[PDB]
Design a protein around this motif. Structure first.
Motif, PDB file in Angstrom:
ATOM      1  N   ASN B  71       0.824  -1.078  -0.053  1.00 61.52           N
ATOM      2  CA  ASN B  71      -0.082   0.060   0.050  1.00 61.52           C
ATOM      3  C   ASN B  71       0.748   1.175   0.173  1.00 61.52           C
ATOM      4  OD1 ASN B  71      -1.742  -2.157   0.546  1.00 61.52           O
ATOM      5  ND2 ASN B  71      -3.111  -0.917   1.961  1.00 61.52           N
ATOM      6  N   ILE B  72       0.606   2.146  -0.989  1.00 59.57           N
ATOM      7  CA  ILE B  72       1.598   3.384  -1.039  1.00 59.57           C
ATOM      8  C   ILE B  72       0.423   4.434  -1.332  1.00 59.57           C
ATOM      9  CG2 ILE B  72       3.065   4.653  -2.877  1.00 59.57           C
ATOM     10  CD1 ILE B  72       4.434   1.816  -3.551  1.00 59.57           C
ATOM     11  N   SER B  73       1.060   5.516  -0.529  1.00 58.61           N
ATOM     12  CA  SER B  73       0.329   6.721  -0.428  1.00 58.61           C
ATOM     13  C   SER B  73       1.033   7.905  -0.537  1.00 58.61           C
ATOM     14  CB  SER B  73      -0.641   6.595   0.829  1.00 58.61           C
ATOM     15  OG  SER B  73      -1.423   8.164   0.761  1.00 58.61           O
ATOM     16  N   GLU B  74       0.710   8.929  -1.411  1.00 57.89           N
ATOM     17  CA  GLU B  74       1.751  10.219  -1.396  1.00 57.89           C
ATOM     18  C   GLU B  74       0.623  11.346  -1.317  1.00 57.89           C
ATOM     19  OE1 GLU B  74       4.724   7.287  -2.806  1.00 57.89           O
ATOM     20  OE2 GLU B  74       4.248   8.867  -4.513  1.00 57.89           O
ATOM     21  N   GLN B  75       0.423  12.192  -0.464  1.00 51.41           N
ATOM     22  CA  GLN B  75      -0.323  13.171  -0.371  1.00 51.41           C
ATOM     23  C   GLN B  75       0.349  14.416  -0.595  1.00 51.41           C
ATOM     24  OE1 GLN B  75      -2.677  10.614   2.982  1.00 51.41           O
ATOM     25  NE2 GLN B  75      -3.062  12.944   2.866  1.00 51.41           N
ATOM     26  N   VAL B  76       0.848  15.065  -1.708  1.00 52.71           N
ATOM     27  CA  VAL B  76       1.555  16.421  -1.769  1.00 52.71           C
ATOM     28  C   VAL B  76       0.677  17.375  -1.668  1.00 52.71           C
ATOM     29  CG1 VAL B  76       2.972  17.637  -3.209  1.00 52.71           C
ATOM     30  CG2 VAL B  76       3.387  15.181  -3.064  1.00 52.71           C
ATOM     31  N   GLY B  77       1.149  18.452  -0.633  1.00 53.03           N
ATOM     32  CA  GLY B  77       0.045  19.508  -0.497  1.00 53.03           C
ATOM     33  C   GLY B  77       0.813  20.724  -1.261  1.00 53.03           C
TER      34      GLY B  77
ATOM     35  N   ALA D  78       3.470  20.881  -7.055  1.00 52.18           N
ATOM     36  CA  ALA D  78       2.740  19.857  -7.755  1.00 52.18           C
ATOM     37  C   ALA D  78       1.345  19.746  -7.273  1.00 52.18           C
ATOM     38  CB  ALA D  78       3.101  18.488  -6.963  1.00 52.18           C
ATOM     39  N   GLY D  79       1.002  21.016  -6.371  1.00 49.69           N
ATOM     40  CA  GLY D  79      -0.308  21.374  -6.052  1.00 49.69           C
ATOM     41  C   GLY D  79      -0.798  20.443  -4.962  1.00 49.69           C
ATOM     42  N   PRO D  80      -2.293  20.136  -4.649  1.00 47.86           N
ATOM     43  CA  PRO D  80      -2.652  19.189  -3.727  1.00 47.86           C
ATOM     44  C   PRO D  80      -2.910  17.881  -4.366  1.00 47.86           C
ATOM     45  CG  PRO D  80      -4.439  20.818  -4.617  1.00 47.86           C
ATOM     46  CD  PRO D  80      -3.227  21.058  -5.421  1.00 47.86           C
ATOM     47  N   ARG D  81      -1.972  17.280  -4.987  1.00 44.20           N
ATOM     48  CA  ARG D  81      -1.887  16.065  -5.493  1.00 44.20           C
ATOM     49  C   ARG D  81      -1.944  14.891  -4.471  1.00 44.20           C
ATOM     50  NH1 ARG D  81       2.745  13.505  -8.909  1.00 44.20           N
ATOM     51  NH2 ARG D  81       2.338  12.414  -7.276  1.00 44.20           N
ATOM     52  N   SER D  82      -2.700  13.931  -4.942  1.00 44.37           N
ATOM     53  CA  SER D  82      -2.878  12.784  -3.932  1.00 44.37           C
ATOM     54  C   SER D  82      -2.944  11.572  -4.615  1.00 44.37           C
ATOM     55  CB  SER D  82      -4.360  12.910  -3.210  1.00 44.37           C
ATOM     56  OG  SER D  82      -4.506  11.834  -2.425  1.00 44.37           O
ATOM     57  N   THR D  83      -1.547  10.643  -4.673  1.00 40.40           N
ATOM     58  CA  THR D  83      -1.679   9.444  -5.094  1.00 40.40           C
ATOM     59  C   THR D  83      -1.696   8.321  -4.299  1.00 40.40           C
ATOM     60  OG1 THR D  83      -0.185  10.512  -6.709  1.00 40.40           O
ATOM     61  CG2 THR D  83      -0.404   8.165  -7.079  1.00 40.40           C
TER      62      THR D  83
END
Lengths: 93, 164, 125, 164, 164, 164, 51
Positions: B71-77, D78-83
């Motif tokens: 499980n991989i999660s990346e929440q860039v803000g 990258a803004g509010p990205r969410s992968t």
């Protein structure tokens, strides 16, 4: 021990090769299943009483009720088996 | 009882090693111009051993897998970044079980004493042997006795004139 | 394992109702904290995904700590009106959902209790 | 009891190796102009072994799969990205079980001592052999004895005039 | 007991290889002008093996499927895009189980020693052979012995005048 | 016991291959002007194999289906578009199970040594053969022995005058 | 930062069972005495260091 690994090498060497029902065994298995269910329910209730976080009351009560149902089924099966045995052993041959 | 049988076993082994040495030492040195005696430290202890070996799987290239959850999660803000990786892996490993029952009566340490005679020519003078011949005798005795260094074998060959 | 399978659906639904009730109560508690976004769970999807679908240490010894081995997608509730403190908790919807969730939890209890009552009545003789 | 049977087994093996060496060493060196003796370190320990091997499946090209769940989510705001990528994979692996029972009585280490005679011409002078002939004898003895380096075999052939 | 049977088995195999070599080496070199001896390292260890092989299915072209669920969602508002793909696949894989019981008594390593005589013409001079004839003898012996490199076979043929 | 039966089986196979070679090599080279010997590496290992093969169904043209659910939604408000496709497919696949029990006693590798004589004319001069005739003999022997490259067969035919 | 790692291992194992033989030798001490050398004259000449 040494005996145990000899036994385990024997097990593997029979597995490589491959690649009588007893009523007492079935009764023992059923009793073990009933005891295991009861023990699991008791352990969960004990942990919930001790304030463990990841256990909910509804699950505790449902598990206790399921254990009670299983033990009642065991009691009824024992009663029927005892009645059958006492009927068979009361013959006049 | 059993001790006498073990002792006779040791005596037979020693006698046969002695005879094997004498057999090769006879043609060159001559009949009676060589005497050897053998003593053997033997193994009369019953041993049973079971060995288990696991092949290492720490390298991802040789690792064998049955089930893997990643499980991989990346929440860039780096800002308000939030990376989360939950990895669960179940492996299957190579396995080798060896069961060994050592033989009773094996040789632990063999030490051999060999004595050779002098050389009496036609005149009768007891001329001693040479260094090369002594080295040849040592090599032949080492070959006959089954000389090994893991066992801890010791060999001593000396040259001296025999008594009458 | 048929008693577990027969009672699995209602027990799991009851547990999910309890979890969603906890989440709704947390929503009501945080009704005045600024910057809070109201959250909730899609009950149906989570229930089907639970019905369709850690690693504890190996205590080979009889004298070592058992240790520990240690999942609902939280969906944001769409706000009704904008507020300056950035609090998306609309109390009318949350109260309606709280009453609905409590009612359906009680119904699940009634259904599960009826199933257990019938199963125990069958064995009584 | 059993020890005597093992010893007789060793004696027969050694005698047959000796005879095989003598058979080839006779035609060229001559009858009686060659003597050899063999000693054998044997294996009388009962061993049983089971081996399990798993083929590695860390590479996606050789990985065999039964079920695979790949949930992929990308909420770009990258803004509010969410992968978010949740991957679950169940594999089937190659498996090879080998069960081996080693034979009792195998040879562990063979050392052989060979002695050859000199060459007495028509005059009677004991002329020693040559280096090439000695090398040929060494090669023939190595072939006859089944010389191997994994076992740890040692061979020694020396030239010396035989006694009367 | 069983060891003697194994030894007799080895002796018969060696004798038959020797006779096969002699049979072809006789017509050209001549009766008695060739001598060969064979030693055989045999396999008296009972082995049982089960092999399982899975064909890889990582490529979508060779992947066999039973059930497949592909949920695709794209909520375009890159802006406020939201892509979501939930894929579940159940595969059926090729499977090959091989069960093998190796024969007891197979040959592990064969080494053969062959010696040939010289050529005595009508005058009687022992003329040695030539390089081409020696190569022919080596090839014939390799063919007769079943020479192989996987086994680790060694062959040595030397030319020397036979003794009287 | 069984080993002797296997050895006799090998001897009969080798003798029959030898006779088949001799039969064709006799009319042209002449009786006695040809000698051949055969050695056979045989297969006395019991093997059992089960093979399962699945036809790939990744292409929609060859994919066989039993049930298919295709939910398609498009809520156009790219703007506030919202596409959603939920596809579930159950497939039926081709299946081929092959069960094979290999024969005990098959040939693994055959190597054959053939020697031919020279040609003595009316004068008596041993005239050697020619290259074309040697090639013909090689081809005939390859045909008789069942020469194959998968097995790893080796053939050697040499020309040399026979001894008296 | 937060890292929760749980690992289950399989280890190599070797059990050896030994029954020592009864009657083995612990310590051996040996006393040897040799004679002198009486030549043809009869004088008891002692031996040498090398001998």
């Amino acid at each position: 021990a040494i005996q145990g690994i000899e036994g385990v090498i024997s097990q593997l060497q029979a597995t490589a090769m491959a690649a009588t029902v007893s009523f007492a065994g079935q009764l023992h298995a059923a009793l073990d299943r009933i005891s295991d269910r009861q023990a699991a329910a008791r352990v969960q209730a004990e942990k919930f009483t001790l304030g463990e976080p990841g256990i909910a009351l509804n699950d505790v009560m449902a598990d206790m009720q399921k254990a009670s149902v299983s033990m009642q089924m065991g009691i009824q099966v024992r009663n029927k088996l005892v009645a059958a045995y006492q009927e068979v052993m009361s013959m006049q041959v | 009882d059993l001790n006498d049988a073990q002792l006779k076993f040791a005596n037979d082994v020693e006698s046969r090693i002695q005879r094997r040495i004498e057999a090769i030492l006879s043609p060159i040195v001559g009949n009676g111009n060589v005497h050897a005696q053998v003593t053997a430290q033997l193994d009369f202890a019953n041993k049973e051993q079971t060995e288990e070996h696991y092949s290492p799987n720490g390298d991802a290239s040789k690792a064998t897998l049955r089930s893997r959850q990643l499980n991989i999660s990346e929440q860039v803000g780096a800002g308000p970044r939030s990376t989360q990786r939950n990895e669960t892996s179940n492996y299957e490993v190579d396995r080798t079980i060896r069961h060994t029952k050592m033989n009773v009566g094996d040789i632990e340490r063999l030490s051999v004493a060999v004595v050779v005679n002098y050389k009496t020519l036609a005149d009768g003078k007891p001329l001693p042997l040479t260094a090369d011949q002594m080295k040849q005798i040592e090599d032949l005795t080492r070959e006959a006795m089954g000389f090994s260094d893991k066992r801890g074998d010791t060999l001593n060959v000396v040259n001296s004139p025999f008594s009458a | 394992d048929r008693l577990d399978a027969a009672l699995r659906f209602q027990q799991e639904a009851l547990n999910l109702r309890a979890q969603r009730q906890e989440i709704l109560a947390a929503n009501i508690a945080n009704a005045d904290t600024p910057g809070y976004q109201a959250r909730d769970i899609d009950f149906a999807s989570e229930l089907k995904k639970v019905m369709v679908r850690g690693v504890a240490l190996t205590l080979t010894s009889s004298h070592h700590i058992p240790a520990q081995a240690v999942a609902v997608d939280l969906l944001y509730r769409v706000p009704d009106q904008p507020s300056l403190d950035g609090n998306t908790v609309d109390m009318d919807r949350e109260r309606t959902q709280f009453a609905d969730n409590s009612l359906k939890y009680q119904m699940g209890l009634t259904v599960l209790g009826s199933q257990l009552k019938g199963m125990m009545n069958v064995l009584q003789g």
